[PDB]
Amino acid sequence: TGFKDFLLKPELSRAIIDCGFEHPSEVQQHTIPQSIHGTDVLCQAKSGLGKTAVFVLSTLQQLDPVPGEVAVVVICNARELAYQIRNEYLRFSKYMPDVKTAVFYGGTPISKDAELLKNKDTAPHIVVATPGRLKALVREKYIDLSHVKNFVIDECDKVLEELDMRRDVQEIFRATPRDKQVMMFSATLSQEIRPICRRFLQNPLEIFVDDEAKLTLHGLQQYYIKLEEREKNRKLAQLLDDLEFNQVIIFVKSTTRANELTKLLNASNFPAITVHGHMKQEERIARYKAFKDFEKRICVSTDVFGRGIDIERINLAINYDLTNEADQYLHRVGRAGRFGTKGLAISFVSSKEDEEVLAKIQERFDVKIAEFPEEGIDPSTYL
């Protein structure tokens, strides 16, 4: 039980032991002890090495619950990621009955969030949310953030470069006390986004991977296939029949291509689900749970699952459509091989920018994304 050396509450240490944790990862050893003191954190760590447990365990240790008073706020970029983060708060607050948590995102009636905020059984001390709805709660004064002591922004590089999310986050950030702890996490913190981040911190502890050659997971095998758009469907179906995967995530560049590809997969005895925008959130969550709970092994989605999503059975990520910039690619392939386990990533190169973006990925991370050999690959090399 290595986490007990952090000298955490007995209820925390007990919940950490029920979660199978026994040795802290390097990012948690370098961040948790000094985050407990309320020091601002600007943290960079590779995909899936446990950045969530950093700010989850840290805020839970500093938290002393005051009834009806929001003390901790966490911001992410996607609705299902917020649902995932709130579920991590639930599992580590297992033996803290006083702690109450809530998550808020679009797609649901905002009046019900207002009722949930006033109820004495559900008035949360910790709030996880997407920037849009939480701003709609601050500005209609359904929530009071005059007492926030911990402000967390997960996937901060995406939250602060997209400018509609930055406006909302800064509107939320101005309803909080200025003398609070602020923490930011991302696997990608380029030199261009860090100055923007620093305008929210005050003498922060900064953990970086500046030699970005180990932002690549060594256990992740990366290949590409140069093909034409009309050949993607038959090549993918063959890949899913030959490769031996537990669960696979397939990233597409639009919602129309997600629904049409998923429909063809189900027709060809490849049971799959799809999650994206343009869908009722009742349905987005229902399929998220169906894929998370291993009812189907294939999921087709847009970049709604590109960041943060943690499903341990994903050992195969396929870029059916490549991204526009390298940063989103690294988060995409990061969905496979969680916590330094084995994984396999394959990207389709079907046009000119797939070739320059694939060209720009390899200098950034030192990875030679080899061309997928025509004879196929050994199952042992990714199992």
Binding site: R166, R167, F173, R174, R178, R199
Partner: peptide
Amino acid sequence: AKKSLEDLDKEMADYFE
């Protein structure tokens, strides 16, 4: 009638004093 990247730096400068 929505804020520019300009002004968002200016609001956060004003926020910290």
